[PDB]
Write a protein that binds this ligand. Structure first.
Ligand SMILES: *[C@@H]1O[C@H](CO)[C@@H](O)[C@H](O)[C@H]1NC(C)=O
Ligand SMILES: *[C@@H]1O[C@H](CO)[C@@H](O)[C@H](O)[C@H]1NC(C)=O
Ligand SMILES: *[C@@H]1O[C@H](CO)[C@@H](O)[C@H](O)[C@H]1NC(C)=O
Ligand SMILES: *[C@@H]1O[C@H](CO)[C@@H](O)[C@H](O)[C@H]1NC(C)=O
Lengths: 297, 49, 297, 49
């Protein structure tokens, strides 16, 4: 069932900077007009995040690591990125998580899967009509056991292969603690072709699926566009599309958060970024006046 | 500081007396209540001084 | 001066499910101690009193909680671990007790909250020919962390001589069998052990005891019980904009001043009942015996 | 003694040979004799013969 895609000129991925991005709500307690300090896993301010271009033959879906959490941001217009695979070895010898977004089904299965060398989703231009569906949905071989086959309603998403200036930013935070796979998500419209926008947004909790499996690596599922020009063979026969996605990793950091009167997080301070940030964290204020202050030992 | 000193465990299982009294029988609850009482007394004495 | 409560109200979620405690406690097969199984219980009504007096259990110890009050508390994601152990090693299943089975097998945390239950299985799980289906790990390089399972079998190496898998001198198989026979004494009779582990609620909790709900009363000094949250105050409608994932609120002093009703899903303010000091104005008992009273604030 | 023992049976009861060095005893008694090979099983803490 497996195929070996070829003709992919691998290049060293670019690196960009995350400016004040990746903050989420750390608990479900409602707060208002208060400055609260919390210690958790966050994406550090002004951090270096690698950049992947899914657009010669620069196509990349490598098996990235999963270190204490991952911040995932994607800027697209044609929904090229559908979902992610999580697991340890992806060799059907261990339970592997799966998340997919397709109209036919949204398999949120947690079953042993024999993942191929290049797990991918193939959206192909049919001849009878402009109908788009998976060409090789057999990314696995067989589910020996399914522990959490909690398939939700199949997400209805448009399928087409087009390229244009990006229109929306989808940001995600993945954590795996105490057998809970937590997801925080957001959606903000932006119109740029450059690196991550400079802005502050707080991600709201999405789901708290209790999969409880071991996760070490992860890979992104991408929609391969088989066209009439391409031969159609599962080695080089597909079209490019336009997409971009970024990866960052979470670390244990202490943050000072600001809640407005409506209860939304509007600003944050990373204490360990600078001595000025340590001074702000010690004084529990976002402004510091003239003087000399002792901050640590 | 006196109001913020009301959220310290002082070695007990919790800083809320209602949680202690709703989860433990009296002979075992008194042991945690004593620690809470000691801590809060010390805080009050420091404020008065 | 203190205003006294007039009544009491209790509000619990309307869940009709019954927790499947029957199947876990008495099933066909119980695993061996070195590889214990874990069953997760959620979204049901649990009646621990019937378990408290179902059968003559050998021991029923609860740590951090009292068995009589288990019926009035709400928990989240109750766990249940079952295994078969020797009679003499039951004392090492208590938290903080060092021993062979605690060091190299099932280990409880120091801050363990829950109940440990054991009973005698010599009437059924004692074969005259000998029960060798139950194993245990006798050699291990280091101490096990709390709530950790080991399923990897490798030849233990003692001394400078390397085993290299020959299983010869200074090399032993980590697993050792059991000799449960009816001819053995009471100390060697096998005992089945079930450990219930509770975690306190911060997310919404659905594992609650069978407590009937009462009607909600507002604008009166009343005692309330919201999913275990106990207190006294006046419940009033509030305009605070709780987000859908938020269940209660807090102030600067970190006191619960808002709550969401588990049944009707409405937001209620919590205000403590009126109180103050009392002062008595007197003109001197020599002059007269008439007094005036001032109520502070 | 334990390392490169070349002994037919080096068995310690109630203690590990590797950890014998750390903890300190006093008045160690050394009893020696000669038995048959088939009688080795009889020399055990809890056997007979
Ligand atoms: C998870 O998988 C890794 C392999 O990447 C392994 O080293 C580890 O022991 C496994 N278990 C845990 C609890 O990390
Ligand atoms: C809070 O929400 C109200 C209602 O939309 C809005 O008018 C007000 O500007 C908000 N406050 C902010 C954004 O600080
Ligand atoms: C298992 O335990 C339940 C509860 O005590 C009891 O009603 C049931 O009969 C038991 N089943 C067996 C097979 O012993
Ligand atoms: C049961 O609880 C739900 C909330 O999940 C509520 O909408 C419904 O009205 C309740 N039913 C009754 C009979 O109280």
């Amino acid at each position: 069932q497996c195929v070996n895609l070829t003709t992919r000129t691998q290049l060293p991925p670019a690196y960009t900077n995350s400016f004040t991005r990746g903050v989420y709500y750390p608990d479900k307690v409602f707060r208002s007009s208060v400055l609260h300090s919390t210690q958790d896993l966050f994406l550090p301010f002004f951090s270096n995040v690698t950049w992947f271009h899914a657009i010669t033959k620069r196509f990349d879906n490598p098996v990235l690591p999963f270190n204490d959490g991952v911040y995932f941001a994607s800027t697209e217009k044609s929904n090229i990125i559908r979902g992610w695979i999580f697991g340890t070895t992806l060799d059907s010898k261990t339970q592997s998580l799966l998340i997919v977004n397709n109209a036919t089904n949204v398999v949120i299965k947690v079953c042993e899967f024999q993942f191929c060398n290049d797990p991918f989703l193939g959206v192909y231009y049919h001849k009878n009509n402009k109908s788009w569906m998976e060409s090789e949905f057999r990314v696995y071989s067989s589910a020996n056991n399914c522990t959490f086959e909690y398939v939700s309603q199949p997400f209805l998403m448009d399928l087409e292969g087009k390229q244009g200036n990006f229109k929306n930013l989808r940001e995600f935070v993945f954590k795996n603690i105490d057998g809970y796979f937590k997801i925080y998500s957001k959606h903000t419209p932006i119109n740029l072709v450059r690196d991550l926008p400079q802005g502050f947004s707080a991600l709201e909790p999405l789901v708290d699926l209790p999969i409880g499996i071991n996760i070490t690596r992860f890979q992104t599922l991408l929609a391969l566009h088989r066209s009439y020009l391409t031969p159609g063979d599962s080695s080089s026969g597909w079209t490019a599309g336009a997409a971009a996605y970024y990866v960052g990793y979470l670390q244990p950091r202490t943050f000072l958060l600001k809640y407005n009167e409506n209860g939304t997080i509007t600003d944050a301070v990373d204490c360990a970024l600078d001595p000025l940030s340590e001074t702000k964290c010690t004084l529990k204020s976002f402004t510091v006046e003239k003087g000399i202050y002792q901050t640590s030992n | 500081t006196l109001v913020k000193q009301l959220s310290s465990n002082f070695g007990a299982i919790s800083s809320v007396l209602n949680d202690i009294l709703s989860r433990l029988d009296p002979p075992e609850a008194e042991v945690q209540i004593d620690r809470l009482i000691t801590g809060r007394l010390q805080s009050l004495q420091t404020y008065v001084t | 001066f203190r205003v006294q409560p007039t009544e009491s109200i209790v509000r619990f979620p309307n869940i009709t499910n019954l927790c499947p405690f029957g199947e876990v406690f008495n099933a066909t097969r119980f695993a061996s101690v070195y590889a214990w199984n874990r069953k997760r219980i959620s979204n049901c009504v649990a009646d621990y009193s019937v378990l408290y007096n179902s059968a003559s259990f050998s021991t029923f110890k609860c740590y951090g909680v009292s068995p009589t009050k288990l019926n009035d508390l709400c928990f989240t994601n109750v766990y249940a671990d079952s295994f078969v152990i020797r009679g003499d090693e039951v004392r090492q299943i208590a938290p903080g007790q060092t021993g062979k089975i605690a060091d190299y097998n099932y280990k409880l945390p120091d801050d363990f909250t829950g109940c440990v239950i054991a009973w005698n299985s010599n009437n059924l799980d004692s074969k005259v020919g000998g029960n060798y289906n139950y194993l245990f790990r006798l050699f291990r390089k280091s101490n096990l962390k709390p709530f950790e399972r080991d399923i990897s079998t490798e030849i233990y190496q003692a001394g400078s001589t390397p085993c290299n898998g020959v299983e010869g001198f200074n090399c032993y198989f980590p697993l050792q069998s059991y000799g449960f026979q009816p001819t053995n004494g009471v100390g060697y009779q096998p005992y089945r052990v079930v450990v219930l582990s509770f975690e306190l609620l911060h997310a919404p909790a659905t594992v609650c005891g069978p407590k009937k709900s009462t009607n909600l009363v507002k604008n009166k000094c009343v005692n309330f019980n919201f999913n275990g949250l106990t207190g006294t105050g006046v419940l009033t409608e509030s305009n605070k904009k709780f987000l859908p994932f938020q269940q209660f609120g807090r102030d600067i002093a970190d006191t619960t001043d808002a709550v969401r009703d588990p049944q009707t899903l409405e937001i209620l303010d919590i205000t403590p009942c009126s109180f103050g000091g009392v002062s008595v104005i007197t003109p001197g008992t020599n002059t007269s015996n008439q007094v005036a009273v001032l109520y502070q604030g």
